[PDB]
Scaffold this motif. Structure first.
Motif, PDB file in Angstrom:
ATOM      1  N   UNK A 114      -2.813  -0.933 -13.121  1.00  0.00           N
ATOM      2  CA  UNK A 114      -1.319  -0.697 -12.305  1.00  0.00           C
ATOM      3  C   UNK A 114      -1.261  -1.906 -11.425  1.00  0.00           C
ATOM      4  N   UNK A 115      -2.475  -2.463 -10.988  1.00  0.00           N
ATOM      5  CA  UNK A 115      -2.060  -3.556  -9.875  1.00  0.00           C
ATOM      6  C   UNK A 115      -1.667  -4.683 -10.567  1.00  0.00           C
ATOM      7  N   UNK A 143      -0.903  -3.154   5.050  1.00  0.00           N
ATOM      8  CA  UNK A 143       0.283  -3.701   4.490  1.00  0.00           C
ATOM      9  C   UNK A 143       1.448  -3.950   5.810  1.00  0.00           C
ATOM     10  N   UNK A 144       1.460  -3.206   6.825  1.00  0.00           N
ATOM     11  CA  UNK A 144       2.553  -3.564   7.501  1.00  0.00           C
ATOM     12  C   UNK A 144       2.314  -4.603   8.442  1.00  0.00           C
ATOM     13  N   UNK A 178      -6.294   1.960 -12.058  1.00  0.00           N
ATOM     14  CA  UNK A 178      -5.634   1.175 -10.933  1.00  0.00           C
ATOM     15  C   UNK A 178      -5.469  -0.494 -10.931  1.00  0.00           C
ATOM     16  N   UNK A 218      -4.324  -8.784  -0.541  1.00  0.00           N
ATOM     17  CA  UNK A 218      -4.556  -7.217  -0.555  1.00  0.00           C
ATOM     18  C   UNK A 218      -4.530  -6.670  -1.997  1.00  0.00           C
ATOM     19  N   UNK A 219      -3.668  -6.720  -2.578  1.00  0.00           N
ATOM     20  CA  UNK A 219      -3.413  -6.271  -4.049  1.00  0.00           C
ATOM     21  C   UNK A 219      -4.752  -7.178  -4.798  1.00  0.00           C
ATOM     22  N   UNK A 244      -0.097  -9.813   1.274  1.00  0.00           N
ATOM     23  CA  UNK A 244       0.085  -8.287   0.244  1.00  0.00           C
ATOM     24  C   UNK A 244      -0.448  -8.689  -0.943  1.00  0.00           C
ATOM     25  N   UNK A 245      -0.255  -9.957  -1.526  1.00  0.00           N
ATOM     26  CA  UNK A 245      -0.593 -10.347  -2.815  1.00  0.00           C
ATOM     27  C   UNK A 245      -2.244 -10.403  -2.662  1.00  0.00           C
ATOM     28  N   UNK A 251       4.149 -11.655   3.009  1.00  0.00           N
ATOM     29  CA  UNK A 251       4.125 -11.459   1.639  1.00  0.00           C
ATOM     30  C   UNK A 251       2.957 -11.982   0.881  1.00  0.00           C
ATOM     31  N   UNK A 252       2.255 -13.066   1.409  1.00  0.00           N
ATOM     32  CA  UNK A 252       1.131 -13.494   0.695  1.00  0.00           C
ATOM     33  C   UNK A 252      -0.024 -12.673   0.961  1.00  0.00           C
ATOM     34  N   UNK A 262      -9.437  -0.172   5.860  1.00  0.00           N
ATOM     35  CA  UNK A 262      -8.531   0.837   4.894  1.00  0.00           C
ATOM     36  C   UNK A 262      -7.518  -0.259   4.357  1.00  0.00           C
ATOM     37  N   UNK A 263      -7.303  -1.022   3.254  1.00  0.00           N
ATOM     38  CA  UNK A 263      -6.547  -1.568   2.811  1.00  0.00           C
ATOM     39  C   UNK A 263      -5.025  -1.351   2.990  1.00  0.00           C
ATOM     40  N   UNK A 264      -4.727  -0.110   2.913  1.00  0.00           N
ATOM     41  CA  UNK A 264      -3.173   0.306   2.843  1.00  0.00           C
ATOM     42  C   UNK A 264      -2.771   0.289   4.086  1.00  0.00           C
ATOM     43  N   UNK A 317      -8.140  -5.218  -3.762  1.00  0.00           N
ATOM     44  CA  UNK A 317      -8.109  -3.878  -4.040  1.00  0.00           C
ATOM     45  C   UNK A 317      -8.606  -3.753  -5.682  1.00  0.00           C
TER      46      UNK A 317
END
Lengths: 119, 40
Positions: A56-57, A8-9, A53, A19-20, A16-17, A13-14, A3-5, A23
């Protein structure tokens, strides 16, 4: 696949980009897969949820653009995202259009990934 | 247009590959909570 979400933690930062992008590509793939099925009520519901989505992304990624230090990479990025965003709101967008967006998102994601392994 | 974007991208992916450091300042500015929301 995880699960992508939940990633995140533990993501830089990269990451995270990326993962977006992951998705956005997954949602775009699904919207393309069901594009011809949109005369079923649920499939049209699903299709619009997914285009939303992706919108939005992509619109988030544009809002993260640093034009000051990003320079020309920033400007080109902004230019590609705006075209995507503008396509995605077309009333009469076509399957092939979405396929080419998908191709762009995948080429860009792979770039981001190359940058990731250099870091 | 999407054809245009496509042509851009064949170049831009090279910008990023080749100007890593600036690619990151360009793009890696995500607010963690937004990312979390977009990843539901």
């Amino acid at each position: 696949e995880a699960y992508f979400q939940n990633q995140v933690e533990t993501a830089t930062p990269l990451e995270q980009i990326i993962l977006l992008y992951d998705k956005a590509i997954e949602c775009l793939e699904r919207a393309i897969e069901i594009y011809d099925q949109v005369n079923e009520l649920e499939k049209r519901k699903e299709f619009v949820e997914n285009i939303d989505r992706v919108y939005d992304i992509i619109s988030a990624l544009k809002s993260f653009l640093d034009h000051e230090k990003g320079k020309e990479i920033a400007k080109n990025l902004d230019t590609i995202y705006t075209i995507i965003l503008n396509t995605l709101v077309k009333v009469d967008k076509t399957k092939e259009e979405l396929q080419k967006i998908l191709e762009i998102l995948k080429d860009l994601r792979e770039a981001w990934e190359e940058v990731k392994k250099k870091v | 247009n999407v054809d245009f974007a496509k042509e851009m991208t064949e170049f831009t992916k090279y910008q990023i590959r080749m100007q890593s450091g600036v690619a990151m300042l360009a793009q890696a500015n995500a607010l963690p909570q937004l990312v979390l929301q977009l990843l539901r």
